[PDB]
Design a protein around this ligand. Structure first.
Ligand SMILES: *CCCCCCNC(=O)CN(C)S(=O)(=O)c1ccc(N(C)C)c2nsnc12
Ligand SMILES: [Cl-]
Length: 290
């Protein structure tokens, strides 16, 4: 599995800020938009894009405050990302797109697809955001850790000062052992503690046990749309998973209209890091059928 990032930088002005994105492949077709989540960047798609780039345009932005994009002093709430990603998509002059989305990128991708259904010809998704009914279902320490993250005293000392979301939570979401070179690529954006604000805000935005209600409602809305939407779907899942366990994946595979499911094998959250070749190859095959 490749550790390098051999993609030239592209930048565009979005709501007064500069956003970095990968942009490769032919212009004469339908572009594929890749949206990462917390605490990753376009780096998470590095081994998947090369399977799609030969035939389709691949666009992989770094969310505002993350990757190589600018880091303004903001709260970095979900609505803040929604606004920047909206203006990013319009800045590139994109009409119709295929979405490839993960974690908080899935929230952005689904929320966009809901509001712009005519402009979405396909949605490939994996380990995506859904409402979590209770804390009790969480594993012992994961419960303790994320409840702690969702505070201003301990959570900030953990994520901001100690950088545990990068140093601990991130590699714990990969089944295989992430190398130090790969960790360094993920560490790069957050060397300065002040730049770690999005890393702390995202876990506080997670819809867990009704809180926050605004995020829960927003998430509930795009799930309803997805059940009703006849758009083609590709759901990658792994065992035991994290946000999406194997039983939930099989359930949605049957429930969601026009939805092929793919088993990547062993996997937690960053499925891209455990089986990039299968995810990359299957997306390409799936695109050639659309
Ligand atoms: C999608 C945003 C978080 C992804 C960060 C990657 N790291 C992990 O997922 C680490 N996990 C293995 S965890 O042990 O911290 C963990 C365990 C369980 C759950 N759930 C019960 C959903 C979880 N949600 S986020 N991290 C989790
Ligand atoms: Cl998070």
């Amino acid at each position: 599995i490749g550790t390098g990032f051999p993609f030239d930088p592209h930048y565009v002005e979005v709501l007064g800020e500069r956003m970095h994105y990968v942009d490769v492949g032919p212009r004469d077709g339908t572009p594929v938009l890749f949206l990462h989540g917390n605490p990753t960047s376009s780096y998470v798609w590095r081994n998947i894009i090369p399977h799609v780039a030969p035939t389709h345009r691949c666009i992989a932005p770094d969310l505002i405050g993350m990757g190589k994009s600018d880091k303004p002093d903001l709260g970095y709430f979900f609505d803040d990302h929604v606004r920047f990603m909206d203006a990013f998509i319009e800045a590139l002059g994109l009409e119709e797109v295929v979405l490839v989305i993960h974690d908080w990128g899935s929230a952005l991708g689904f929320h966009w697809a809901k509001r712009n259904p005519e402009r979405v010809k396909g949605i490939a998704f994996m380990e995506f955001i859904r409402p979590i009914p209770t804390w009790d279902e969480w594993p012992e320490f994961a419960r303790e850790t994320f409840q702690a993250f969702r505070t201003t005293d301990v959570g900030r000392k953990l994520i901001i000062d100690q950088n545990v979301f990068i140093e601990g939570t991130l590699p714990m979401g990969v089944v295989r052992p992430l190398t130090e070179v790969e960790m360094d690529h993920y560490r790069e954006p957050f060397l300065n503690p002040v730049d770690r604000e999005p890393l702390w805000r995202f876990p506080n935005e997670l819809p867990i046990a009704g809180e926050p209600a605004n995020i829960v409602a927003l998430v509930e809305e795009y799930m309803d749309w997805l059940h009703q939407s006849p758009v083609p779907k590709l759901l990658f899942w792994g065992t035991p998973g994290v946000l999406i366990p194997p039983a939930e994946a099989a359930r949605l595979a049957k429930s969601l209209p026009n939805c092929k499911a793919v088993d990547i094998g062993p996997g937690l959250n960053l499925l891209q890091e455990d089986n990039p070749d299968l995810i990359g190859s299957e997306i390409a095959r799936w695109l050639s059928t659309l």
